[PDB]
Design an enzyme around this catalytic site. Sequence first.
Site, PDB file in Angstrom:
ATOM      1  N   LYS A  71     -12.252  -6.655 -13.448  1.00  0.00           N
ATOM      2  CA  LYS A  71     -11.154  -7.385 -14.064  1.00  0.00           C
ATOM      3  C   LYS A  71     -10.703  -8.583 -13.199  1.00  0.00           C
ATOM      4  N   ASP A  72     -10.685  -8.425 -11.872  1.00  0.00           N
ATOM      5  CA  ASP A  72     -10.385  -9.548 -10.973  1.00  0.00           C
ATOM      6  C   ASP A  72     -11.421 -10.651 -11.140  1.00  0.00           C
ATOM      7  N   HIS A 115       0.807  -1.220   0.000  1.00  0.00           N
ATOM      8  CA  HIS A 115       0.000   0.000   0.000  1.00  0.00           C
ATOM      9  C   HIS A 115       0.844   1.276   0.000  1.00  0.00           C
ATOM     10  N   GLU A 137       4.726 -34.895  -3.171  1.00  0.00           N
ATOM     11  CA  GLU A 137       3.750 -34.026  -3.820  1.00  0.00           C
ATOM     12  C   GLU A 137       4.427 -33.205  -4.924  1.00  0.00           C
ATOM     13  N   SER A 187       1.397  -0.862  -6.524  1.00  0.00           N
ATOM     14  CA  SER A 187       1.851  -1.837  -7.491  1.00  0.00           C
ATOM     15  C   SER A 187       2.827  -1.212  -8.470  1.00  0.00           C
TER      16      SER A 187
HETATM   17  C1  HEM Z   1      -0.793 -16.119   0.283  1.00  0.00           C
HETATM   18  C2  HEM Z   1       0.143 -15.387  -0.474  1.00  0.00           C
HETATM   19  C3  HEM Z   1       0.077 -14.092  -1.023  1.00  0.00           C
HETATM   20  C4  HEM Z   1      -0.921 -13.176  -1.150  1.00  0.00           C
HETATM   21  C5  HEM Z   1      -2.398 -13.235  -0.708  1.00  0.00           C
HETATM   22  C6  HEM Z   1      -0.397 -12.083  -1.937  1.00  0.00           C
HETATM   23  C7  HEM Z   1      -1.143 -10.998  -2.403  1.00  0.00           C
HETATM   24  C8  HEM Z   1      -0.665  -9.939  -3.173  1.00  0.00           C
HETATM   25  C9  HEM Z   1      -1.479  -8.897  -3.758  1.00  0.00           C
HETATM   26  C10 HEM Z   1      -2.995  -8.673  -3.567  1.00  0.00           C
HETATM   27  C11 HEM Z   1      -0.673  -8.169  -4.555  1.00  0.00           C
HETATM   28  C12 HEM Z   1      -1.124  -7.110  -5.547  1.00  0.00           C
HETATM   29  C13 HEM Z   1      -1.616  -7.647  -6.888  1.00  0.00           C
HETATM   30  C14 HEM Z   1      -0.563  -8.464  -7.621  1.00  0.00           C
HETATM   31  O1  HEM Z   1       0.511  -7.896  -7.944  1.00  0.00           O
HETATM   32  O2  HEM Z   1      -0.827  -9.661  -7.900  1.00  0.00           O
HETATM   33  C15 HEM Z   1       0.674  -8.629  -4.327  1.00  0.00           C
HETATM   34  C16 HEM Z   1       1.828  -8.052  -4.851  1.00  0.00           C
HETATM   35  C17 HEM Z   1       3.117  -8.563  -4.706  1.00  0.00           C
HETATM   36  N1  HEM Z   1       3.447  -9.726  -4.043  1.00  0.00           N
HETATM   37 FE1  HEM Z   1       2.217 -11.003  -3.163  1.00  0.00          FE
HETATM   38  N2  HEM Z   1       0.943 -12.294  -2.192  1.00  0.00           N
HETATM   39  C18 HEM Z   1       1.236 -13.548  -1.691  1.00  0.00           C
HETATM   40  C19 HEM Z   1       2.483 -14.164  -1.752  1.00  0.00           C
HETATM   41  C20 HEM Z   1       3.640 -13.600  -2.286  1.00  0.00           C
HETATM   42  C21 HEM Z   1       4.896 -14.292  -2.468  1.00  0.00           C
HETATM   43  C22 HEM Z   1       5.094 -15.773  -2.134  1.00  0.00           C
HETATM   44  C23 HEM Z   1       5.768 -13.399  -3.007  1.00  0.00           C
HETATM   45  C24 HEM Z   1       7.143 -13.565  -3.345  1.00  0.00           C
HETATM   46  C25 HEM Z   1       8.076 -14.474  -2.748  1.00  0.00           C
HETATM   47  C26 HEM Z   1       5.032 -12.172  -3.214  1.00  0.00           C
HETATM   48  C27 HEM Z   1       5.532 -11.030  -3.837  1.00  0.00           C
HETATM   49  C28 HEM Z   1       4.804  -9.898  -4.205  1.00  0.00           C
HETATM   50  C29 HEM Z   1       5.356  -8.744  -4.859  1.00  0.00           C
HETATM   51  C30 HEM Z   1       6.852  -8.495  -5.073  1.00  0.00           C
HETATM   52  C31 HEM Z   1       4.317  -7.949  -5.217  1.00  0.00           C
HETATM   53  C32 HEM Z   1       4.370  -6.636  -6.020  1.00  0.00           C
HETATM   54  C33 HEM Z   1       4.258  -6.924  -7.503  1.00  0.00           C
HETATM   55  C34 HEM Z   1       4.295  -5.668  -8.341  1.00  0.00           C
HETATM   56  O3  HEM Z   1       3.525  -4.730  -8.067  1.00  0.00           O
HETATM   57  O4  HEM Z   1       5.074  -5.623  -9.302  1.00  0.00           O
HETATM   58  N3  HEM Z   1       3.726 -12.327  -2.814  1.00  0.00           N
HETATM   59  N4  HEM Z   1       0.647  -9.776  -3.574  1.00  0.00           N
HETATM   60  C1  LIG Z   2      -2.318  -2.128  -4.894  1.00  0.00           C
HETATM   61  O1  LIG Z   2      -2.663  -3.463  -5.195  1.00  0.00           O
HETATM   62  C2  LIG Z   2      -3.774  -4.225  -5.007  1.00  0.00           C
HETATM   63  C3  LIG Z   2      -4.505  -4.238  -3.717  1.00  0.00           C
HETATM   64  O2  LIG Z   2      -4.154  -3.574  -2.744  1.00  0.00           O
HETATM   65  C4  LIG Z   2      -5.696  -5.068  -3.616  1.00  0.00           C
HETATM   66  C5  LIG Z   2      -6.393  -5.021  -2.266  1.00  0.00           C
HETATM   67  C6  LIG Z   2      -6.118  -5.823  -4.674  1.00  0.00           C
HETATM   68  C7  LIG Z   2      -7.382  -6.764  -4.636  1.00  0.00           C
HETATM   69  C8  LIG Z   2      -7.107  -8.060  -3.835  1.00  0.00           C
HETATM   70  C9  LIG Z   2      -7.429  -8.286  -2.561  1.00  0.00           C
HETATM   71  C10 LIG Z   2      -8.139  -7.212  -1.708  1.00  0.00           C
HETATM   72  C11 LIG Z   2      -7.143  -9.590  -1.704  1.00  0.00           C
HETATM   73  C12 LIG Z   2      -7.667  -9.504  -0.284  1.00  0.00           C
HETATM   74  C13 LIG Z   2      -7.876 -10.652   0.597  1.00  0.00           C
HETATM   75  C14 LIG Z   2      -7.272 -10.926   1.847  1.00  0.00           C
HETATM   76  C15 LIG Z   2      -6.233 -10.011   2.511  1.00  0.00           C
HETATM   77  C16 LIG Z   2      -7.604 -12.186   2.733  1.00  0.00           C
HETATM   78  C17 LIG Z   2      -6.923 -12.560   4.088  1.00  0.00           C
HETATM   79  C18 LIG Z   2      -7.221 -13.968   4.510  1.00  0.00           C
HETATM   80  C19 LIG Z   2      -8.215 -14.650   5.203  1.00  0.00           C
HETATM   81  C20 LIG Z   2      -8.073 -16.159   5.432  1.00  0.00           C
HETATM   82  C21 LIG Z   2      -9.497 -14.012   5.790  1.00  0.00           C
HETATM   83  C22 LIG Z   2      -9.962 -14.429   7.173  1.00  0.00           C
HETATM   84  C23 LIG Z   2     -10.976 -15.478   7.143  1.00  0.00           C
HETATM   85  C24 LIG Z   2     -11.553 -16.307   8.076  1.00  0.00           C
HETATM   86  C25 LIG Z   2     -11.234 -16.334   9.575  1.00  0.00           C
HETATM   87  C26 LIG Z   2     -12.625 -17.322   7.709  1.00  0.00           C
HETATM   88  C27 LIG Z   2     -14.026 -17.064   8.189  1.00  0.00           C
HETATM   89  C28 LIG Z   2     -14.607 -18.297   8.672  1.00  0.00           C
HETATM   90  C29 LIG Z   2     -15.913 -18.696   8.780  1.00  0.00           C
HETATM   91  C30 LIG Z   2     -17.097 -17.803   8.370  1.00  0.00           C
HETATM   92  C31 LIG Z   2     -16.377 -20.062   9.325  1.00  0.00           C
HETATM   93  C32 LIG Z   2     -17.872 -20.302   9.128  1.00  0.00           C
HETATM   94  C33 LIG Z   2     -18.380 -21.578   9.641  1.00  0.00           C
HETATM   95  C34 LIG Z   2     -19.159 -21.913  10.749  1.00  0.00           C
HETATM   96  C35 LIG Z   2     -19.603 -23.325  11.114  1.00  0.00           C
HETATM   97  C36 LIG Z   2     -19.692 -20.922  11.767  1.00  0.00           C
HETATM   98  C37 LIG Z   2      -5.381  -5.794  -5.897  1.00  0.00           C
HETATM   99  O3  LIG Z   2      -5.776  -6.463  -6.816  1.00  0.00           O
HETATM  100  C38 LIG Z   2      -4.212  -4.973  -6.036  1.00  0.00           C
HETATM  101  O4  LIG Z   2      -3.611  -5.016  -7.263  1.00  0.00           O
HETATM  102  C39 LIG Z   2      -4.247  -5.066  -8.532  1.00  0.00           C
HETATM  103  C1  LIG Z   3       6.137 -28.535  12.735  1.00  0.00           C
HETATM  104  C2  LIG Z   3       6.632 -28.422  11.302  1.00  0.00           C
HETATM  105  C3  LIG Z   3       7.719 -29.079  10.820  1.00  0.00           C
HETATM  106  C4  LIG Z   3       8.600 -30.023  11.614  1.00  0.00           C
HETATM  107  C5  LIG Z   3       8.236 -29.012   9.457  1.00  0.00           C
HETATM  108  C6  LIG Z   3       8.139 -27.959   8.612  1.00  0.00           C
HETATM  109  C7  LIG Z   3       9.206 -27.535   7.689  1.00  0.00           C
HETATM  110  C8  LIG Z   3       9.710 -28.228   6.637  1.00  0.00           C
HETATM  111  C9  LIG Z   3       9.717 -27.761   5.186  1.00  0.00           C
HETATM  112  O1  LIG Z   3       9.654 -26.467   4.665  1.00  0.00           O
HETATM  113  C10 LIG Z   3       8.970 -25.571   5.437  1.00  0.00           C
HETATM  114  C11 LIG Z   3       9.754 -28.958   4.194  1.00  0.00           C
HETATM  115  C12 LIG Z   3       8.315 -29.260   3.786  1.00  0.00           C
HETATM  116  C13 LIG Z   3      10.720 -28.731   2.914  1.00  0.00           C
HETATM  117  O2  LIG Z   3      11.121 -27.440   2.745  1.00  0.00           O
HETATM  118  C14 LIG Z   3      12.467 -27.371   2.535  1.00  0.00           C
HETATM  119  C15 LIG Z   3      10.003 -29.262   1.654  1.00  0.00           C
HETATM  120  C16 LIG Z   3      10.553 -28.677   0.350  1.00  0.00           C
HETATM  121  C17 LIG Z   3      10.092 -30.796   1.682  1.00  0.00           C
HETATM  122  C18 LIG Z   3      10.654 -31.443   0.482  1.00  0.00           C
HETATM  123  C19 LIG Z   3      10.654 -32.944   0.585  1.00  0.00           C
HETATM  124  O3  LIG Z   3       9.398 -33.507   0.598  1.00  0.00           O
HETATM  125  C20 LIG Z   3       9.221 -34.860   0.663  1.00  0.00           C
HETATM  126  C21 LIG Z   3       7.932 -35.401   0.683  1.00  0.00           C
HETATM  127  O4  LIG Z   3       6.859 -34.593   0.665  1.00  0.00           O
HETATM  128  C22 LIG Z   3       7.764 -36.806   0.730  1.00  0.00           C
HETATM  129  O5  LIG Z   3       6.463 -37.325   0.757  1.00  0.00           O
HETATM  130  C23 LIG Z   3       6.323 -38.663   0.417  1.00  0.00           C
HETATM  131  C24 LIG Z   3       8.878 -37.692   0.754  1.00  0.00           C
HETATM  132  C25 LIG Z   3      10.167 -37.196   0.724  1.00  0.00           C
HETATM  133  O6  LIG Z   3      11.250 -38.058   0.752  1.00  0.00           O
HETATM  134  C26 LIG Z   3      11.206 -39.068  -0.187  1.00  0.00           C
HETATM  135  C27 LIG Z   3      10.409 -35.748   0.701  1.00  0.00           C
HETATM  136  C28 LIG Z   3      11.768 -35.136   0.677  1.00  0.00           C
HETATM  137  O7  LIG Z   3      12.805 -35.816   0.716  1.00  0.00           O
HETATM  138  C29 LIG Z   3      11.800 -33.682   0.612  1.00  0.00           C
HETATM  139  C30 LIG Z   3      13.167 -33.016   0.593  1.00  0.00           C
END
Ligand code: HEM
Ligand SMILES: COc1c(O)c(C)c(C/C=C(\C)CC/C=C(\C)CC/C=C(/C)CC/C=C(\C)CC/C=C(\C)CCC=C(C)C)c(O)c1OC
Ligand SMILES: C/C=C(C)/C=C/C=C/C(OC)[C@@H](C)[C@H](OC)[C@@H](C)CCc1oc2c(O)c(OC)cc(OC)c2c(=O)c1C
EC number: 7.1.1.8
Lengths: 62, 385, 385, 55, 245, 125, 93
Positions: C228-229, C202, C272, C206
């Site tokens: 668009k999303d 923020h 996996e 972007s």
């Molecule tokens: C659960 C995971 C994640 C969520 C919900 C998330 C969400 C977002 C959102 C909403 C944006 C803006 C829209 C977009 O550019 O797609 C963003 C931008 C970005 N995210 Fe993530 N992200 C996640 C994981 C990651 C990871 C794993 C990386 C890198 C290791 C990462 C790197 C970035 C970067 C660098 C940007 C800026 C891109 C740009 O504006 O050029 N994000 N992310």
């Molecule tokens: C400047 O850049 C942006 C940007 O800022 C945004 C916001 C967006 C749009 C995208 C988003 C807003 C993504 C937002 C979403 C999140 C941050 C989600 C966080 C994660 C969660 C898991 C939410 C929390 C949820 C729960 C606790 C679950 C609720 C559970 C329930 C209701 C259980 C119900 C069941 C029973 C039995 C009672 C863009 O696209 C973008 O670039 C184009």
């Molecule tokens: C309480 C939490 C705990 C202790 C652990 C969390 C942290 C660990 C990790 O990262 C966070 C870890 C997942 C790792 O990351 C480097 C992954 C890339 C794992 C890669 C991985 O997978 C395998 C797998 O899935 C298998 O299935 C059948 C079998 C496997 O052998 C044959 C492997 C294996 O040899 C390796 C290197």
Amino acid sequence: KSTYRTPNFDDVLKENNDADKGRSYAYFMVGAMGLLSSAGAKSTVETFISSMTATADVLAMA
Amino acid sequence: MAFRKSNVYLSLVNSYIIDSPQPSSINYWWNMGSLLGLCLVIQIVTGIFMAMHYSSNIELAFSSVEHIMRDVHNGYILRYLHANGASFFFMVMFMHMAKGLYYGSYRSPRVTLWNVGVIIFTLTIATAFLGYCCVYGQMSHWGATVITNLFSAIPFVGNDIVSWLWGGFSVSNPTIQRFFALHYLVPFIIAAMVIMHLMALHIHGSSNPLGITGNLDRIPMHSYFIFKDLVTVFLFMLILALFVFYSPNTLGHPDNYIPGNPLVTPASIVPEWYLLPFYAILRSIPDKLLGVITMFAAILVLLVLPFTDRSVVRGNTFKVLSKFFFFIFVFNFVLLGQIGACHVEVPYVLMGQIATFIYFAYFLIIVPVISTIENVLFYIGRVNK
Amino acid sequence: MAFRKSNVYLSLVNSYIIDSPQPSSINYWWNMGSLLGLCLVIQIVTGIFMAMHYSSNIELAFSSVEHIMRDVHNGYILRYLHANGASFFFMVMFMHMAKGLYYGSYRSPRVTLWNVGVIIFTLTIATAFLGYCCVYGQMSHWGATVITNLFSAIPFVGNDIVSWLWGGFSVSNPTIQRFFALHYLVPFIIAAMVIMHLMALHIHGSSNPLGITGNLDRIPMHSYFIFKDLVTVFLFMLILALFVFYSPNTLGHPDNYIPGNPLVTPASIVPEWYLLPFYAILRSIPDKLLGVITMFAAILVLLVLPFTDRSVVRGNTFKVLSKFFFFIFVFNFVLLGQIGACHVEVPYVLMGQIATFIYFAYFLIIVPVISTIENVLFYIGRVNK
Amino acid sequence: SSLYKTFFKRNAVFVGTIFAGAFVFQTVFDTAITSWYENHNKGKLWKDVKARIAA
Amino acid sequence: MTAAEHGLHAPAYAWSHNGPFETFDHASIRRGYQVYREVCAACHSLDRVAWRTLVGVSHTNEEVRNMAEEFEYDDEPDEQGNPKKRPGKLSDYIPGPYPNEQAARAANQGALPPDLSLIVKARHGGCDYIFSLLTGYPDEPPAGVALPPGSNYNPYFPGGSIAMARVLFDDMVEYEDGTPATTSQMAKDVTTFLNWCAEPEHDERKRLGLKTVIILSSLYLLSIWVKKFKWAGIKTRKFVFNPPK
Amino acid sequence: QSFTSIARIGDYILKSPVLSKLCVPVANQFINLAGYKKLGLKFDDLIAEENPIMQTALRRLPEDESYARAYRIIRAHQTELTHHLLPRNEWIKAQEDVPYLLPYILEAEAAAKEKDELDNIEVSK
Amino acid sequence: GPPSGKTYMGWWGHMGGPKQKGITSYAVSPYAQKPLQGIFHNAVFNSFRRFKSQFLYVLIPAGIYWYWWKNGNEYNEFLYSKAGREELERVNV
Ligand code: HEM
Ligand SMILES: COc1c(O)c(C)c(C/C=C(\C)CC/C=C(\C)CC/C=C(/C)CC/C=C(\C)CC/C=C(\C)CCC=C(C)C)c(O)c1OC
Ligand SMILES: C/C=C(C)/C=C/C=C/C(OC)[C@@H](C)[C@H](OC)[C@@H](C)CCc1oc2c(O)c(OC)cc(OC)c2c(=O)c1C
Ligand code: HEM
Ligand code: HEM
Ligand code: HEM
Ligand code: HEM
Ligand SMILES: COc1c(O)c(C)c(C/C=C(\C)CC/C=C(\C)CC/C=C(/C)CC/C=C(\C)CC/C=C(\C)CCC=C(C)C)c(O)c1OC
Ligand SMILES: C/C=C(C)/C=C/C=C/C(OC)[C@@H](C)[C@H](OC)[C@@H](C)CCc1oc2c(O)c(OC)cc(OC)c2c(=O)c1C
């Protein structure tokens, strides 16, 4: 009243013949609180961490 | 500028915890909120470590908790912290709420703050009930039965809700497994609501015991109130420690050391102590539907206080009649709880019905009447025409 | 001002989702982030509803998942959504990361944004592993065994960590019960890290496909990118639906329909699919300690890119050599995964060791050398002295 | 007090010294308490009962 | 509610484990086990107590092993799949007299003798109650009380009518340590034993509490002092007003 | 409750010598028990200020009264936090406990009430 | 940045109070002040004051409710004793 005439603080001011009296007391207290906290935190962390070790009922000598 | 200000994450910490301008005169009653955050942390940490050893199956749940008590290293400490901590969580919440009541903290511009608080309270009550069921002792089973049945009072589709909540014909395995899953979830929703609570707190800041503006004399949170918080944090821990180690079962019920039995409801069944005032209110109404409506209304009526407080000054510090009736309210609330702990017998039934009336009359009648009178008394005591 | 601006809660929504100024030219590659938030929601919702029916005891875990498949109304839909959704969560994360790599999104001033992203990636990998163990099929047991053993490579205190993680002599009931408890927790920590990710997003906004400033032409999030999303949200759901209903087991492993057996490791064991490139990297090093160090380093080396990208322009759009080597990197990564799926046999062992080298050489050698050359080429192609 | 100004000399005690003192405290304090506790309960302990059994 | 329906309030005996600094008496625990084995175990299970927990508490490693091996437990089937039995080991739980609930009711006029693993915590009054119940059977019920056939009178039980007869009589047990086995002595002992069964962590819990309360007390007193110091500038602050012209 | 309404009820009581002799002594004793004068406050210092009427009113207060209110409020907070009352010779006397802000409040309420009336006037032909 | 609703609290330098003039404050370092063996002699007859004002507001409602509780309890006790079983039959249903 004139702002240059500073009000009386005599009831609060330590009649300073020992300069570092309050400092030594404060730093001892702050130091002792720091000691007993760190030991407390250590014990709390160990309590939780040890709850994950093998339970008394699963240590079977096969 | 300083890094604590310029950094995106640290500036949040700085504006909430370090440089946050506090009114110089807030007293130890303003320490309860930090104690509530601490409570929330204690409950979550101890619950997660116990979850590691807990089985939610209705056949295994009670024994899995005995397993935590007997076999898990320091397991009894975790369980007793959790159980006694839940109680301490309510003690402190009641005090936090009572503080708000006394000092007019619910007033404008803090109405949103108060309303979010009432939601947290409902969620916290639901969370503790879900946890209590997970033990699956006798009180667990019948607590789950009685409370899920609250919804059967709903016109036409009520018994359908209940069988849906149960997952079958009665409180069974489906029920206890879903109540554990839900007990794990809701603490995190409470955490999100606490953040919303602190957001509304931040835009207007705390009130103070004088009920007037704090804008003319602020001191930073850091140092002064960080270390002042520490004083009550340790006192809180000391007392919680005395219960956990020396008297761990004094705040619970002996029947919950008996596995739940679907065929037998103990004669000795009593709700958890923090639910007793509300229980008494329900029990005072000799009708099913109206009993559960009135009990829920006893919580929602908290929402009405910003409108029925007609006074022109915030808080009770300089209000003789309001102070008196506030303490009537508090001790009336304690009575409601003592009635809840008693048998449905002659003197008690009537006393409970009168105490129930006093409870509602406070918000709806006493406060509007008395605050109006005090308004006028303040005026005619100084104006000479 | 408008209420969406003045209200304390709505203004957050307004500044992030409604009035947020977007660069006019961002393409569909910038839709992946919203798809990741959607994925996170799908995983959490379906997991909670399944948790209601799941037993974590090592005797009951596999059957309790068969119970979800057979007896729970729409249970197979929940399980298949969760399992296939985890895979889709990784597909989209790789694309989100690859997008960042290509367009120089890791660059200043978005380094913090990138670093928090790398943490989320580690947490997401750990979360999926914890979930995979909860099935307690054959792949679950040996996955848990192999991965907890990663820590045994730690000097002196490594086997102590492992027995502490296990809660005993081997992967057993303690292990699976604590892995379920942890699998429930970490999604919520990922949610908090996503908020920290969006906070860093923020303050700088972007980037865009040209790699230059977006400040001269913004359009609001609302309407344009909300709708668009929606286009990619539905396309995402369509494809996920084709797997969940028509091909629900194509992305998993048949051995995990066999209950875990502590005495027998199947010859057909394969990680996996989304873990295969990393697996291959570890397998390429014929040393225990160095195998696990190099594999972890393959994730951490992502942190190095802001420093080794020496270019003076952000992104690869106008860079001929960088585009070429970027696609060498991508297809090298796919090869690493195809090697992971193969037997430890002649051509494959060497190919994996060379692909491993190419993987690290990209960040540490190719990008710094090539970006320097491109810097100089841009200069001498226009300067006439 | 001048007992402070000999060790720490008008400066506050530093974390490293605090952490180090805490490790020392933990062991000393535990032994002091276990000793008092087991002594206060002399006669009742298993230690004491085992001294009156042999088989 | 009527006094009979409530049951007689149990009085407060001077248990040696009462009090914050007091451990169990482990000799009384040892004896109480014998009373359980020789009297109570004929009707009462003790399902939650494993043999190993006795070691170092009331018995030696050797004694417990002999005691466990006197019982047979189901073992893993042989090479051919036929069931087979096994002497007990320290990992096993103390076995109960009845195979199921229906067999327990049959042997007790239709009544179910509760498991005693938690009985001290599962009743108001705790040790006082259990003791008082066991020593509180009158030879005859108070006049006018019509007892159901098969029931017994005991004033400490709610409603007065209890399905367990008096079972403790003088010298029905030969204490291995020479102690006169009077009924009140035996009651005192099992009850002490049953408190340990329900609260095995008792002695250790109170030892930890002593440390925890000392540290937290000190931290409390200390923080007061530190707070006062950090506030001294603000508390003794003084204002003057000179109204502006 | 508006100050226009408190003034209505209060003035009715103050004029009719039946009520005036009955109530004012009660009111006088209520004010002394309230205790705010022992902190150095005047009643009008106690009025909750977080609304538009009171902000208008405080804005319109002459400078010298404004600086005086500021001192009395700061002095009250400092005394409150020391858990003392002021020296008795510093207490506000009844002669000083004047409704100094009341006229500004009443004026602002009337202005506000008229605007609300005029924004909602109906017309008849 | 993104706009902002007007509130009744600002921040350091613009708290939202009225303009202050004429007030002068003084203070002295905690370091220069008497180590905390002062309070008492000067301050213990001082406090224990703020509850002379208050104790009646607490005590009188407490008294009313304790009396009312004790009375209802003693009445219930009578009703379920022998002496009261006649009155019990009367007041019950
Ligand atoms: C659960 C995971 C994640 C969520 C919900 C998330 C969400 C977002 C959102 C909403 C944006 C803006 C829209 C977009 O550019 O797609 C963003 C931008 C970005 N995210 Fe993530 N992200 C996640 C994981 C990651 C990871 C794993 C990386 C890198 C290791 C990462 C790197 C970035 C970067 C660098 C940007 C800026 C891109 C740009 O504006 O050029 N994000 N992310
Ligand atoms: C400047 O850049 C942006 C940007 O800022 C945004 C916001 C967006 C749009 C995208 C988003 C807003 C993504 C937002 C979403 C999140 C941050 C989600 C966080 C994660 C969660 C898991 C939410 C929390 C949820 C729960 C606790 C679950 C609720 C559970 C329930 C209701 C259980 C119900 C069941 C029973 C039995 C009672 C863009 O696209 C973008 O670039 C184009
Ligand atoms: C309480 C939490 C705990 C202790 C652990 C969390 C942290 C660990 C990790 O990262 C966070 C870890 C997942 C790792 O990351 C480097 C992954 C890339 C794992 C890669 C991985 O997978 C395998 C797998 O899935 C298998 O299935 C059948 C079998 C496997 O052998 C044959 C492997 C294996 O040899 C390796 C290197
Ligand atoms: C051996 C000395 C012994 C003890 C100890 C003991 C205790 C005991 C308790 C505490 C209860 C629970 C009472 C309550 O609900 O408050 C209880 C109940 C029953 N018992 Fe027992 N008991 C001891 C010995 C014996 C023996 C040897 C027998 C069988 C002949 C026996 C039987 C029972 C039965 C039956 C009950 C049920 C009481 C009821 O439900 O009315 N016990 N015992
Ligand atoms: C606001 C937070 C919480 C409150 C008020 C709360 C309250 C309670 C209560 C009242 C009980 C029963 C206590 C008893 O044994 O008598 C309970 C049990 C339990 N709780 Fe929580 N709880 C909270 C959070 C959590 C969380 C996040 C978890 C994590 C899984 C959790 C896991 C459990 C478990 C495993 C039990 C059964 C063990 C036991 O009986 O103590 N709780 N909880
Ligand atoms: C888990 C629960 C809660 C947490 C963590 C919490 C925390 C806080 C914190 C930190 C403060 C500031 C310090 C203080 O005044 O104590 C505060 C203020 C406040 N809270 Fe809560 N709170 C909780 C529940 C509630 C509830 C249940 C209500 C009311 C129904 C409520 C009403 C208020 C109000 C009105 C204030 C402002 C008080 C004032 O400044 O005068 N809170 N809370
Ligand atoms: C980022 C979020 C999550 C991811 C990536 C994730 C991933 C996974 C994976 C890979 C599996 C095994 C799938 C399979 O059956 O082959 C799994 C299983 C499971 N997950 Fe999650 N999960 C997440 C969140 C949750 C949450 C919050 C819960 C709530 C309790 C949960 C509960 C479960 C349960 C009950 C299982 C066993 C049922 C099954 O095998 O599908 N998950 N998860
Ligand atoms: C203007 O008014 C204020 C004011 O603003 C503040 C901030 C304070 C000071 C008080 C606070 C800052 C309270 C703050 C606390 C919270 C908001 C807490 C929110 C709740 C949570 C539950 C935190 C989240 C925690 C977790 C997810 C748990 C972490 C779990 C772990 C580590 C599991 C570990 C185990 C294993 C096996 C890996 C005041 O006192 C005050 O008035 C005087
Ligand atoms: C998935 C979640 C579900 C279905 C339920 C959550 C919501 C319900 C509540 O509030 C949120 C609810 C707890 C209620 O709130 C009005 C409380 C004051 C309950 C008060 C309560 O307690 C009892 C109790 O504890 C018992 O134990 C042995 C026994 C009880 O009968 C004897 C009761 C009882 O008669 C009442 C009214």
